[PDB]
């Protein structure tokens, strides 16, 4: 026999899609292993520590800033599109949307940055599938919605479903957007070896700097915080890190370029904290109660 690797997964169509793609990619190494999905965050992690599962595949922006002792991120594959995307009901770009246009998103990070660019538009909550939000755009009060360009690609959508791709200058992406995270036990050296070939350290070094900034600022999906990293020619990491207030009238923004990803994410957090961004994040976490 050969070892059968158990991969836990959230039951959504997107989650099982990512899980099967990682398995499909891990099979091309031709190494003696079996793979098996077991439909199931805290259950996942403890199940992995309990050894009832062996690994898990998440969206990097859905990974908690801090992993429990004993678990690690053993592989970050090649990064997909990292940008937010605007889809309008009537095909307008962001600057072309009429006054009072309603843009649908539940992300304070996305809403606060758009409000910083234009305060004459409204940001309203919206729920559901990529496929569900596209129908609500057609039938409801929304004039546009914001979606991750990586999510549209994984669900097999046209790049021309997007009206406009938001460059990081307009909307700094969430930490790890477009990237996958393969979580496993840090002492499973056999699994870590299989995951090495799928890893892509140009993506990994950039995301590591993003995650340190997220970690030092105590951030998450619910907090209006953003960070995008990329490798420049020469090995340097360029990290754009941002903290915004919900009404979009306060923008802490910092650009760092260096060689050590941990030191880069450290300085961005050290720098923005001194400007008063950590005080902001506490009030927003308090407001969420």
CATH of the domain at 242: 3.30.160.40
Of 120, 143, 178, the residue that ends a domain is 178
Burial class (CB in 10 A: 0-12, 13-18, 19+), 14: middle
Last residue of one domain, picked from the residues 199, 233, 264: 199
Give the whole-angstrom CA distance, residue 183 versus residue 9: 11
66 & 137 share domain: no
Q: Distance between CA 16 and CA 64 in Å, rounded?
A: 19
The verdict on 93 and 163 lying in the same domain is yes
DSSP annotation of 240: E
- Closest by Cα among 219, 226, 181 to 44: 181
The residues, ordered by sequence, that sit 6+ positions from 235 with a Cβ below 8 Å of its Cβ are 259
Task: Tell me, yes or no, whether 56 and 102 share the same domain.
Answer: no
Same domain for 124 and 238: no
Cα separation of 29 and 56, whole Å? 19
CA distances from 289 to 59, 109, 244, 280, 283 (A): 26, 18, 19, 15, 10
CA pair distance 221, 219, nearest whole angstrom: 7
Residues 100, 120 contacting (CB under 8 angstroms): yes
Nearest to 152 by CA among 102, 96, 86: 86
Domain-embedded: residue 109? yes
- Please tell me whether residues 66 and 113 are part of one structural domain: no
Q: Tell me, yes or no, whether 276 lies in a domain.
A: yes
Does 215 lie in the same domain as 125? Answer: no
- Cβ contacts of residue 107 below 8 Å, gap of 6+? 146, 174, 221
Instruction: Tell me if 164 is assigned to some domain.
Output: yes
Tell me the CA distances in angstroms from 46 to 59, 64, 87, 250, one per residue in order.
18, 14, 38, 39
Pairwise CA distance, residues 54 & 48, whole Å = 6
My answer on whether 68 and 206 are in the same domain is no
Shared domain check, 235 and 172? no
d(CA 22, CA 212): 25
β-bridge mates for residue 58, sequence order: 181
Say how far apart CA 4 and CA 48 lie, in whole Å: 15
Same domain, 84 and 173: yes
Residue 205 sits at φ, ψ, to 5 deg, of: -60, -40
Q: What is the dihedral of CA 111, 117, 122, 124, to 10 degrees?
A: -10
Contact criterion met (CB below 8 Å) for 162 and 86: yes
Q: Is residue 121 part of a domain?
A: yes
Q: What is the CATH number of the domain that holds 104?
A: 3.40.190.10
| Total domains present in the chain | 3
Q: In what order do the strands lie in the sheet with 237-244?
A: 225-231, 237-244, 251-258
Q: Could you give the dihedral angle defined by the CA atoms of residues 142, 143, 148 and 153, in that order, rounded to the nearest 10 degrees?
A: 100
How far, in Å, CA of 142 to CA of 286, rounded? 29
Supply 50's token pair: 């309990």
**How far is the C-alpha of 55 from the C-alpha of 182, rounded, in Å?**
7
Q: Alpha helix (H) ranges present in the chain?
A: 13-27, 42-49, 108-117, 130-139, 149-154, 189-196, 201-216, 261-274, 277-287
47 with 161, same domain: the answer is no
87 and 224 in a common domain: no
CB neighbours of residue 283 within 10 Å: 11
Which residues have C-beta within 8 Å of that of residue 223, sequence separation ≥ 6? 108, 109, 281, 284, 285
Sheet holding 180-185, edge to edge: 34-39, 4-9, 55-59, 180-185, 71-75
Looking at the structure, tell me whether residues 214 and 279 fall in a common domain: yes
Residue 82 maps to a domain: yes
Name the nearest CA neighbour of 40 among 11, 80, 2, 1: 11
* Neighbour tally for 187: CB within 10 Å: 11
Q: How far is CA 226 from its chain centroid?
A: 9
Exposure string of 241-252, with b = 16+ CB inside 10 Å and e = fewer, is bbbbbbebeebb
Q: Which two tokens stand for residue 145?
A: 């919605």
Q: With H, G, I as helix, E, B as strand and everything else as coil, classify residue 168.
A: coil
User: Which residues lie closer than 8 Å to 100 by C-beta, 6 or more apart?
Assistant: 120, 121, 122
Per the structure, the complete domain to which residue 22 belongs is given by 1-77+179-199
Q: What is the distance of C-alpha 248 from the center of its chain?
A: 21
Q: Which of 116, 145, 178 is the last residue of a domain?
A: 178
Residue 289 maps to a domain? no
CA pair distance 95, 76, nearest whole angstrom: 35
């Amino acid at each position: 026999h050969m070892r059968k690797i158990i991969v836990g997964s959230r039951r959504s169509k997107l989650a099982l899609t990512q899980t099967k793609w990682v398995i499909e990619q891990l099979k091309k190494q031709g190494l003696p292993f079996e793979f098996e999905i077991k439909e199931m965050v805290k259950e996942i992690e403890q199940a992995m520590l309990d050894k009832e599962i062996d690994m898990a595949v998440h969206s990097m922006k859905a990974m908690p800033a801090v992993l429990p002792e004993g678990l690690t991120i053993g592989c970050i594959p090649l990064r997909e599109d990292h940008r937010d995307a605007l889809i309008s009901k009537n095909g307008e770009r962001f600057e072309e949307l009429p006054s009072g246009a309603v843009i649908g998103t539940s992300s304070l990070r996305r809403g606060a940055q758009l409000l910083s660019m234009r305060s004459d538009i409204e940001i309203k909550w919206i729920r559901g599938n990529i496929d569900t939000r596209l129908e609500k755009l057609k039938n409801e009060d929304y004039d546009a919605i914001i979606l991750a360009a990586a999510g549209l690609s994984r669900m097999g959508w046209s790049k021309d479903t997007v009206t406009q791709y938001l460059e990081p200058e307009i909307s700094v992406p969430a930490v790890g957007q477009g990237a996958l995270a393969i979580e496993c036990r840090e002492n499973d050296h056999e699994l870590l070896s299989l995951l090495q070939a799928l890893n892509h350290d140009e993506t990994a070094r950039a995301v590591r700097a993003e995650r340190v900034f997220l970690k030092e600022m105590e951030g998450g999906c619910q907090v209006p915080i953003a960070g995008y990293g990329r490798i420049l020619d020469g090995g340097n990491i360029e990290l754009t890190s941002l903290v915004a207030s919900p009404d979009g009238k306060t923008i802490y923004k910092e650009h760092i370029t260096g060689k050590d990803p941990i030191a880069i994410g450290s300085e961005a957090a050290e720098r923005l904290t001194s400007q008063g961004a950590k005080l902001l994040i506490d009030r927003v976490k308090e407001e969420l109660d």
